[PDB]
Amino acid sequence: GSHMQDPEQLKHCNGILKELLSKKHAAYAWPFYKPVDASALGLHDYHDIIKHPMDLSTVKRKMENRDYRDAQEFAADVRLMFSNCYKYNPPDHDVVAMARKLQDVFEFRYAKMP
Ligand SMILES: Cn1c(=O)c2c(ncn2CC2OCCO2)n(C)c1=O
Ligand SMILES: Cn1c(=O)c2c(ncn2CC2OCCO2)n(C)c1=O
């Protein structure tokens, strides 16, 4: 059920999303800007292992289309994106190091939900 706080909380989520996409974090956020192109990268098992792909461009489209009804739904998608990275890649892979840094940006600001 929708709560009167949902629009304001979604604005906070949109602000986080803008930050994740901003130049400030680009050095480690860039792998997450677009869907994993498994075939281009030679990752021919990616879609057998990752059943629910997610990335920041998809989160952005869902936010712009008013798909997310509340902050929790938004956060589940952002976390899904990171979890897919941790599931597919060895934990010492550089993309995992980048995911951990971007997730730290996300979690600390999500925790500041007004
Ligand atoms: C392959 N590769 C990128 O694609 C990239 C990048 N730094 C940023 N990006 C992403 C680019 O910025 C705007 C959206 O695409 N670097 C260092 C890189 O190696
Ligand atoms: C999330 N994600 C990527 O974005 C990715 C990738 N393999 C390549 N890329 C694109 C870029 O190349 C070097 C760092 O990320 N994998 C396995 C992955 O999980």
3-state secondary structure the chain: CCCCCHHHHHHHHHHHHHHHCCHHHHHHHHHHCCCCCCCCCCCCCHHHHCCCCCCHHHHHHHHHCCCCCCHHHHHHHHHHHHHHHHHHCCCCCHHHHHHHHHHHHHHHHHCCCC
Cβ proximity of 102 and 20 under 8 Å: yes
Resolution in angstroms comes to 1.2
* Residue 5, amino acid: Q
> Structure solved using which method?
X-ray
Distance 36 CA to ligand 2 centre (A): 6
CATH of the domain at 105: 1.20.920.10
Structural domain tally of the chain? Answer: 1
Residue 62: which domain range?
5-111
Atom of ligand 2 nearest to the CA of 84: 19
* Residue (of 39, 32, 38) closest to 60 by Cα position: 32
Which listed ligand is nearest to 23 at the C-alpha?
Answer: 1
Distance 3 CA to ligand 2 centre (A): 37
* Residue (of 89, 113, 106, 94) closest to 27 by Cα position: 94
Phi/psi-derived region of residue 76, left when phi > 0, alpha when psi is between -120 and 50, beta in every other case: alpha
Residue nearest to atom 5 of ligand 1 (CA): 30
